[model samples]
Target: EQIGKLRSELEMVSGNVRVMSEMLTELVPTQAEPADLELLQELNRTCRAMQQRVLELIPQIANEQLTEELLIVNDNLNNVFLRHERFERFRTGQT
Candidate 1:
């Protein structure tokens, strides 16, 4: 599976993501609020957390902690992407 290799490739992708964040910040409309940009940072951390989980998985590690982490990370992810019951819900899901 080259889990190690896959992890390495993920690192590269994350680097690309950080750079893209910079580019996005530069391109956003002046009308954009500071709070909106803050959301991007959370989104970035959520991506990083997802990747971290895989690193944990690659080891074929033991139990408990990994599952616990996955649940927490999953919630953070859903909170960011889904936002909630049809409503980003409808916030962060927007722009």
Candidate 2:
């Protein structure tokens, strides 16, 4: 029962990310300045990183039957977070 609820929440978060991405696309086209475009691009990248993490959880939830899928998702999410951390450091002008 708890797992079911968690799965539903994860699915909702995934949908929310998709909606946010769509809205971000619209905003970028209407953005008035270069700074705004850069900001939006950063936001989009961050969101994609987060979305990938969330997706990585799905295979684990699907079933113990999907051991390979679960490992792939887990690895993919780990890589995504690592890349995001690197990007964040660059964005903040930190070494």
Candidate 3:
């Protein structure tokens, strides 16, 4: 359950990144009035910084809610494995 939630959250994050990328692509070559050049540059810089932060978080989601959710999912899987092993042991004992 937690894992599924994490996956969903991650998907949302990915979607956001895709949207940001598209926006950035569209804005990159935009022509602006001379007065707006500084504004455009500022926009570019801010976008680049945001993109970098996103990239950094992609690999290291540790301690984040998304990461915890994913870990919970993995932990549940591990519990299942342990239960299966215990069941096998019980059957062997009965034999």
Candidate 4:
């Protein structure tokens, strides 16, 4: 559930970056000054890179969540075993 939320947020950020890139592209003039064009191009590149990185991170985040869940399940299983052991000891009149 937490991983899903993180992925959703990352997807939202990616969408925002894409929208910003589109708006910048539309606002920039073909005959704009070289420096302005260069800056805009750099911004576009950065946005693209950020979007790609966030998308890549989503899977890693999900894997982390999976690892955590596995650990929790293992702990619960251990608890169940401990309880059974105690019950057996009680039935056998062991201290």
Q: Largest TM-score belongs to which candidate?
A: 2
Each candidate structure's TM-score, on Cα atoms with residue i matched to residue i, is: 0.34, 0.44, 0.33, 0.38
lDDT of 1 at 60: 68
Q: What does candidate 4's lDDT look like per residue over 1-95, in tens digits?
A: 54454444444444444444444444445445677557646654664564465456545643444676555544543543454454334334451
Q: What is the C-alpha RMSD of each candidate to the true structure, in Å?
A: 9.7, 8.6, 20.3, 24.7
lDDT of 3 by residue, 1-95 (tens): 43454344444434433443444444442343454445445544554554455455446655555656667545644543454344334324431
Better of 1 and 3 by TM-score: 1
Ranking by lDDT: 2, 4, 1, 3
Q: Between prediction 1 and prediction 2, which has the larger lDDT?
A: 2
Clashing pairs counted in every model: 6, 0, 0, 0
Off by over 4 Å in 3: 1-31, 62-95
Candidate 2: residue pairs that collide: none
Question: Of the pair 1 and 4, which is ahead by lDDT?
Answer: 4
- Candidate 1 vs. true structure, TM-score: 0.34
Model 3 / residue 30 / CA error / Å:
8.6
lDDT of 1 by residue, 10-94 (tens): 5543554554344454545344568755765665566566567656654663444455555654454444333222221123333
Which residue pairs clash within candidate 1? 82-88, 83-88, 83-89, 84-88, 84-89, 87-90
- Per-model CA lDDT versus the true structure: 0.48, 0.50, 0.45, 0.49
